[PDB]
Structure 1
């Protein structure tokens, strides 16, 4: 077996090769189905959606017409009608009025379509909402009880504005923009850094869905909101976008072990008169402190209202993220904010002791709670019950849907006597807990995956891995008599689905390893003898695939039975034009951290197109989902709890050796490893731990030191740093710099200079320690499109010079 050496191109030649082979658009999303209700017309529904019609183009609202019937000989390809005349990330909509509300650039706008006004046959010039406010407005939302009112955030405070009367009003006075950020570290209605970055919650205020009627023929609107105080949170400096303006932007980063923000709930209570004028605005706070009522709660993971507006709800986590509580909060728990201590005591006495927080569900785990967007609340039939669907990995170690009924008891605790409540004083007895689904597979509830409930047929639609861990599929099952789980999506593809609100259609964005992404509309229907049985039928195409592009050769998914007692899956890019009796240099691409799966049956020729490019130059490319990876259940994921950096490279090496024994073209002498973020971290660990296996390591934005990363992430997987002193040490490459090679041309560090999730300090502290330890490195910095081209060029060239070509074999 002779060594194959890659063609040694020049820098300018490699730039040309990358430029030629380079030459995507946001696929249709945020679907909404509106009925036409037109007996004489040919269309049943209009679908509205956000999309990008070309690659240059900006993201905007489109519509398409769903016909009542189709020619089943042909394939109907739906046309994209523009709804409007900068760019839109999301949109709100009120059904009854047909009002869209959306931000585009700095402006907030509104149009109407598909309400009583009817259905336009051409673009709509939208109406700009007026404002006195000097700064950018964020997070606009229509009031569900009155589409004339909207809310939004300006300078970390909540405002409301009437789109008819033009009345604007600031609701919270929590942030003063002109003062310094040391004293004023407060905010209302905005989610803090950790909650956005690590729990995917972006909004921090919620309209009450219904309005209460006043005595004099007006109404009361309500906004539940989160108020944060980040005064005790660590302040860190990262260099500003403008390098000519030599300064640093301050922001609050709760690093692991330190304080999270000081959180609490609030309610704005807005009295409006008979003709839409604001009478009064009472701001209201909890009767007792957040720490007392919600003992142990550190993070407000999720929050909203019940469909009737009766209770606000919230899904709450402790600091270790091992205990989740779903908690109903009455509006009567809130009293007006009064600085006068005598008048404050009055208002506490006026509230009954019966009014109390209601923990309607609690769960625990020795691993961790993964937060998700599934939580469906049924309408309240009985007065002292709440019925709902939730998902959990805590029973079986796999995420499944459960139908739960809780009893809303009077609390044992009484506030009159004025003590502190015990841990379980607000817990509700669980009357029923039916498991809707079960097995060695999971229901999906993140990154857009959720459920749709058909209350009439008493069915729930959900996405899952039942058929395979490498394919997402749409399923349906009864929540009343749960049994047979009907699949609705076709095997051989992975699907991301959106079910119509009327449960009579669904859209699926699907692909597989060979075929690019497509979006198609499927009609749901039942046989006459049984509404429980659900069948699907292709209706029309919304987006066609480009068709497998000859320049891109896809990988083969493989798998091996690991000594760890798990099947591990991988992707293998065999080199283009294999020579018999030769062995090629192998580049292992890695991520390997939690909340990610790189190996699955989806089209990888957009995101990971440049893996195919490495294979065209003569490299073998391997990707392996090690233990900790997503979509295999909680026990699989928990493998590295307290032990980050200590099991991942075993699984990689094991898979790399499995491939080697079966394919003689893999040259274990010339193996490189490369990844970004956790992949960059593991790449450093690979070179540190296994010099023998890995010749080169390219680390991108690597986490080098876990005490520098945030609370929400790090404490979930590694606990508090006091209770895992060794794991934090052994898991931190910056404090083991002595273990790196004394040879140069084996370590490449890549970092963005301004990156604020994985800070540059991770790289700069490593560099400092490598210099202390007399170790070599190579460094590329990317301050501030053009730099991604530079990155790909440098990486191809670095692999060429130090792994692929004959010059690399000489160099040693």
Structure 2
């Protein structure tokens, strides 16, 4: 079998070749319609059932569109919905709030907060609407604006890490919290109000830190009380890091912010003006009420506003509690310590945190966005749907009834609560779903509960670990699960709040993403049984790209007892009796799955380019990758970096003994982030297999990464001395090759997740160890390769590097 050698292009040729095949994209394309809302027309004589509002790009601003849903279609034809701009514009909108009662939209668009009215009592527009600025006196950019659901004249926003409110009719503006000072330096002033800190945004996808009570409590006076639950964070003890401003980064094994809950009680007169603002604090400290809690993972309100709820995690992230928090647990902030004593005694001992759910695992808690509270029908019971892996090892929906009874803990006795004094008994716990597959609850995946038909819609892997599908099941007598989406695609969906329509954004390997609307119905005889009919296209496919050759999906029966899936890009113009150089592309880390039946043409296009130059490309989902349950994810607990390259090599050898065109003496490996890490691990542990590793923004030292990620997967470094040692490439610089042109590092200097520090400390230990390395730095742009200028130079340098040191004739003659 004769080696194939990639045509040795020049840097000028390779630049032009890249510039010609990039007639589209910048690692992403126009954002597909998203954040759908369904509003009923309610016109007996009109042709349209519903108006749908969404965000999309028509290089254009992300903004708000609507489309008309007709009552009936030509079932012969295909209706392409037309996009009607909602807004007049003379940046972008990333999200929006809506109040159905009033038809009020609220959204940030650059520095400005705007509002417009559509779909309420005032009716439906046939023309773009003028966004109305919410006038402010605040000097700095306002962030994270939200309508009071109890009263849509009122909004809240954040300004210099404090919570403010503003009335969009009266223009009254009022600061609620006094915890931060913009003029003091972030070394001195490290307290915030209503803002998710770094680890909760980066490692748990919680972006908001305050929650409006959805109901107003009327006064005797004809006024009302509006309420805001908010987290308050003291980041003083937290490590600072400087990146050519500063910021607060809890490094593994170091302090997370000090956290509590607070309650702002806002009194309004009959005319809608502020009488008073009372800031309120927990009757006892957070550490006393919620013992062992590190992380406030999610929070909000019960539907009637009777309770705040939170999902609370311990530091090890192996204990999850759901807790109800009555607003009566909060008392005014009071400086007079006798007056404060009187406020403490004034609240009954019967008023206590209510742990309505608690679970533990020896692997990890994966936080998700699934939690639905049914209307209370009795004061002593709450009924809710939650999702959990902790019962069977696959994430399933459970319908739970918890009993809300008095604690044995009486605060009057002057003692401190015992570890389970707030545990609620479970009256009932029922599995709504089960089996060797998972319900999705992350990255837009959620449930829609139909409380009239007693159904829940959910997305899952039931049909295949390689496609997300939409499903419905009864939550009252769980039996039959109906798949609502069609096989041969992966679906990302949402359901109308009215439960008579669903939208799917779907793709496969051959076919770019499309977005289509589906009507839902019931056979006249059984409202429980659900059928779908096609209604309309929102976004048409481009169809198979004229140049792009999709990969093939393969699987192998691993010795570890799991099926492993992979993608294979056969080289273009394959020849008999020639074996081609192989690039393995890897992520390999938790919470990600590369191999599924979706279009890889937008973001992984250049794996096709590589194939067009004469490289075999391989991608494998090693143990630890997601959508295969907690046991499969749990393989590397404490052992990150130890098992991943085994699976990669096993799959590569599987492919090699099946296809003689794979040249095992010319394997390169390339990844970003966790994939950068495994590229380094691969060259270090298996220099026999891998000729070259290109490591992009690698983790090189687990103690330099953050609390929320590394402790979930690796525990505390005191309890895993060898895991941290073996897992940390920088601690093992002496195991790298002593021959150059095998190791290439790539990093941006201003990277905010994986710091340049990882590359720079690796470089220090490579230098002390007398080891060669190549380096490409993207000096600015923070996103480094996401920004096209840095990205095109990366693609270019990468293609040349593989040509010079793996692919070409010269490369062979260099060794």
TM-score range normalised by the length of the shorter chain:
over 0.9
Q: How big is the shift at 1:782? A: 0.3
CA distance in 2, matches of 1:279, 1:518: 52
CA positional deviation for 1:179: 1.1
1:413-438: CA deviations, max 9, x gaps? 01001111011000000000000000
Give deviations 1:274-320, integer Å, cap 9, x for gaps: 00110000000000000000000000000000000000000000000
Q: Deviations over 1:633-686 (max 9, x none)?
A: 000000000000000000000000000000000000000000000000000000
- 1:36 deviation in Å? 0.2
1:84-116, Cα deviation, whole Å (9 max, x unpaired): 013100000000100000000000000000001
Distance 1:665 1:164 in 2: 71
Q: Whole-Å Cα distance in 2 between the matches of residues 803 and 263 of structure 1?
A: 52
> CA separation in 1, counterparts of 2:759 and 2:790?
19
TM norm structure 2: 0.98
Residue in 2 aligned with 1:242?
none
**C-alpha displacement of 1:695:** 0.3
Residue equivalent to 1:17: 17
Measured against aligned partners, the alpha-carbon deviations of 1:121-144 in whole angstroms (never above 9, x if no partner) come to: 010111000000000000000000
Runs of 4+ in 1 over 4 A off after TM superposition: none
d(CA) in 2 for partners of 1:499, 1:352: 43
Cα distance between partner residues in 2 of 1:100 and 1:550: 41
Q: How far 1:723 moved relative to its partner? A: 0.1
The CA deviation at 1:182 is 2.1
SS at structure 2 position matched to 1:147: coil
- For residues 552-607 of structure 1, the C-alpha deviation after alignment (integer angstroms, 9 at most, x for no partner) is 00000000000000000000000111000100000000000000000000000001
SS in 1 for 2:535: strand
Equivalent in 706, 730, 738 of residue 710 of structure 1: 706
Mapping 1:160-175, distance limit 5 Å: 160-175=165-180
Residues 463-511 of structure 1: CA deviation (Å, up to 9, x unaligned): 0000000000000000000000000000000000010000000000000
Q: Residue 61 of structure 1: which of 51, 60, 64 is its match?
A: 64
Paired with 2:546 and 2:110, the residues of 1 have a C-alpha distance of 39
Deviation at 1:165, TM superposition (A): 0.2
Report the 3-state secondary structure (helix = DSSP H, G, I; strand = E; otherwise coil) of the residue aligned with 2:355.
strand
SS in 2 for 1:765: helix
Take 1:324 and 1:58, find their aligned partners in 2: how far apart are those partners? 40
Instruction: Tell me by how many angstroms 1:383 deviates.
Output: 1.1
1:347 to partner: Cα distance: 0.5
Q: Distance in 1 between matches of 2:756 and 2:185?
A: 25
| In structure 2, C-alpha distance between the alignment counterparts of 1:173 and 1:676, rounded to whole Å | 41
Higher mean C-alpha deviation, range 41-50 or range 338-347: 338-347
- Secondary structure of the corresponding residue to residue 658 of structure 1: helix
Q: 1:343, 1:748 → 2: CA distance?
A: 66
1:185 aligns with 2:181: no
Matched, 1:522 2:518: yes
Residue by residue over 1:512-566, the C-alpha shift from the partner in whole angstroms, topping out at 9 and shown as x without a partner, is: 0101100000000000000000000000000000010120000000000000000
Deviates most, 333-342 or 195-204? 333-342
TM-aligned CA deviation for residue 199 of structure 1: 0.3
Query: For each residue in 1:200-222, what CA deviation from the matched residue of structure 2 results, as whole angstroms up to 9, or x when unmatched?
Result: 00000000000000011010000
The CA deviation at 1:341 is 1.3
Distance 2:645 2:620 in 1: 10
Counterpart CA distance in 2 for 1:106 and 1:497 is 31
Instruction: Name the SS for the 2:504 alignment partner.
Output: strand
Q: Could you tell me how far 1:14 is from its partner in structure 2?
A: 0.4
Q: Matches of 1:344 and 1:751 in 2, distance apart? A: 54
Deviation at 1:180, TM superposition (A): 2.1
Give the CA deviation at 1:446.
0.2
Matches of 2:668 and 2:183, distance apart in 1: 52
For residues 776 and 679 of structure 2, what CA distance do their matches in structure 1 show?
16
Report the CA distance between 1:340 and its aligned residue: 1.9
Matches of 1:544 and 1:134, distance apart in 2: 44
1:243 alignment partner in structure 2: none
Q: Distance in 2 between matches of 1:496 and 1:64?
A: 20
String of CA shifts for 1:58-93, please: whole Å, max 9, x gaps.
Answer: 100000000000001100000000000131000000
CA distance in 2, matches of 1:753, 1:19: 26
Aligned-partner Cα distance in 2 for 1:353–1:508 = 50
In 2, distance between residues paired with 1:235 and 1:362? 34
Question: Which residue of 2 is the match for residue 42 of structure 1?
Answer: 47
Superposed CA deviations along residues 437-465 of structure 1, whole A, max 9, x for unmatched, are 00000000000000000000000000000
Is 1:764 matched with 2:760? Answer: yes
User: In the alignment, which residue of structure 2 is the partner of 1:215?
Assistant: 220
Shift of 1:183: 2.3
What does residue 725 of structure 1 align with? 721
Structure 1 regions of 5+ residues with no counterpart? 239-247
Q: What CA distance in whole angstroms lies between the structure 2 residues aligned with 1:621 and 1:726? A: 33
- Give the Cα separation in 2 of the matches to 1:179 and 1:629: 44
Q: Distance in 1 between matches of 2:152 and 2:192?
A: 26
- Equivalent pairs counted in the alignment come to 801
Give me the whole-angstrom Cα distance separating, in 2, the residues matched to 1:555 and 1:63.
Answer: 36
Partners of 2:55 and 2:524 lie apart in 1 by: 36
Q: Deviations over 1:679-738 (max 9, x none)?
A: 000000000000000000000000000000000000000000000000000000000000
Q: How does 1:390-409 map to 2 (within 5 A)?
A: 390-409=386-405
Deviation for aligned residue 1:184 = 1.4
How far did 1:339 drift?
Answer: 1.9
Q: In 2, distance between residues paired with 1:340 and 1:585? A: 76
- Give, in whole Å, the separation in 2 of the partners of 1:163 and 1:460: 37
Greater shift in the superposed pair: 583-592 or 182-191: 182-191
Residue aligned with 2:631, SS:
helix
What is the TM-score when the length of structure 1 is the normalising length?
0.98
Residue aligned with 2:494, SS:
strand
Task: State the distance in 2 between where 1:419 and 1:191 align.
Answer: 33
Q: Is the aligned partner of 1:119 residue 2:124?
A: yes
Which is further off, 336-345 or 220-229? Answer: 336-345
